Amino acid sequence: GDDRELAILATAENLLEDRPLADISVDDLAKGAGISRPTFYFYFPSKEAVLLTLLDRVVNQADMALQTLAENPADTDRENMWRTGINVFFETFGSHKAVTRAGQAARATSVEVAELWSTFMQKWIAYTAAVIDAERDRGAAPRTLPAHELATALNLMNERTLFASFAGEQPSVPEARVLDTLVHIWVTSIYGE
Amino acid sequence: GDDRELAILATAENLLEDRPLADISVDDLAKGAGISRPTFYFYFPSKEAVLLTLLDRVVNQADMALQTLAENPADTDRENMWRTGINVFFETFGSHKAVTRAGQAARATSVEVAELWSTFMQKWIAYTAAVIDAERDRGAAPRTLPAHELATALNLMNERTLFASFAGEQPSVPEARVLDTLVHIWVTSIYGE
Ligand SMILES: Cc1ccc2sc(CO)cc2c1
Ligand SMILES: Cc1ccc2sc(CO)cc2c1
Ligand SMILES: Cc1ccc2sc(CO)cc2c1
Ligand SMILES: Cc1ccc2sc(CO)cc2c1
């Protein structure tokens, strides 16, 4: 039932480790899922909708993990609080690099992919800004830039910088250094005068 | 002579304000330059090579402006020194938003476009890192992250953040606020403990 659907998704995510979506045919997905090409189309209109579903699950997995942190504060310093939260994105997207890479490509051609990404970035920026505001209200952070503008740039930094590490781009921060790098830039810019 | 070449480039940059490169034909470029389609191909192998030339000139215009700042230090504080340098990218790419937007798209499909971008980002990161190192040697900046890793993330922040402002993306920092936003994040992360 929904098992044939998982088979298509797992075949898609596995095939994206090797080649781009343009190099993957519907026949490839059906064969890997052990169904016919017409049977495929009963679960998905296109290979793009398969990628969209994959990307939706990764993004919602990150968002839910961040949701879980928010409701359970980790008893630790402010630097570590920020570290733990940025780590959700490092670990979640870093555990799904093929989908992250293919989703980024799809933003140029899929309105749904762009709108999905944009919606969750908006959500994460707003929550970053609220935490910054809370820190300012309690006197732990100085009132420097507008909180939402600062939060926007930091979250766009993470998007671009994590993606480059995962993709092995030149230039990029080494994957084993990128978390420490982003944390330093967040904490100095949030708490620095 | 080279005048027919400028006509093609100026037609291309003007046409990219209205539609993407895929929506622009070689006939459109020839007509706008007042030459035939075969005459076009004597100056350029393809419409992609036209975009590549446009992007090369914008990037080299930024790099040369940054070169000029480096050789003439502006008598001013450290915050302003960084402001003046980030402003070169704000003003140069912001004066060529159609080409900047089309060049970014081309990175996904043109090896030359990606290699051109990557080469100059490497160059600008290395120079950022040298200035950070110089500041540390003179005791003005603390020895926190590796200078080259810090410089990488800040320069990737600017790339992603300026592009989003220019493109009117959601989310983005307003174009009239993005320079102040980036400067704050650079100065706090370079000089902050
Ligand atoms: C990347 C990212 C986005 C939002 C938040 S909120 C927070 C403190 O709980 C850390 C964090 C990190
Ligand atoms: C804070 C933050 C927000 C969005 C994104 S997207 C990504 C990899 O695509 C890492 C990341 C980090
Ligand atoms: C964006 C960018 C890149 C390199 C440099 S160097 C400098 C100080 O002269 C400011 C600056 C800004
Ligand atoms: C510091 C720096 C380096 C590269 C780039 S690219 C860009 C718009 O595409 C702005 C920018 C800024």
Curated annotation (Swiss-Prot), chains A, B:
HTH tetR-type domain span: 2-62
GO cellular component, one term: cytosol
GO molecular function: DNA-binding transcription factor activity; transcription cis-regulatory region binding
UniProt xrefs under Gene3D superfamilies: Homeodomain-like, Tetracycline Repressor, domain 2
InterPro entries: EthR_C (IPR049397), Homeodomain-like_sf (IPR009057), HTH-type_TetR-like_transc_reg (IPR050109), HTH_TetR (IPR001647), Tet_transcr_reg_TetR-rel_C_sf (IPR036271)
Keyword Amino-acid biosynthesis: no
GO BP, sorted A to Z: negative regulation of DNA-templated transcription; regulation of DNA-templated transcription; response to antibiotic
DNA-binding residues (ranges): 25-44
Pfam families hit by this protein: EthR_C (PF21313), TetR_N (PF00440)
Alphabetical keyword list: DNA-binding, Repressor, Transcription, Transcription regulation
Superkingdom as given in the UniProt entry: Bacteria
Summary of the knockout phenotype: Cells lacking this gene leads to ETH hypersentivity.
SUPFAM superfamilies according to UniProt: Homeodomain-like, Tetracyclin repressor-like, C-terminal domain
Activity control, per UniProt: Inhibited by tert-butyl 4-(3-thiophen-2-yl-1,2,4-oxadiazol-5-yl) piperidine-1-carboxylate (RF1) and 1-(thiophen-2-ylacetyl)-4-(3-thiophen-2-yl-1,2,4-oxadiazol-5-yl)piperidine (RF3).
Site description Inhibitor-binding, residues in chain: 155, 158
Role this protein plays: Involved in the repression of the monooxygenase EthA which is responsible of the formation of the active metabolite of ethionamide (ETH).
Quaternary state and interactors: Homodimer.
Note: Binding of inhibitors to EthR induces a conformational change in this repressor, which is then unable to bind its DNA operator, consequently allowing for increased transcription of EthA and bioactivation of ethionamide (ETH).
Name assigned to this protein: HTH-type transcriptional regulator EthR
Originating organism: Mycobacterium tuberculosis (strain ATCC 25618 / H37Rv)
Lineage: Bacteria, Bacillati, Actinomycetota, Actinomycetes, Mycobacteriales
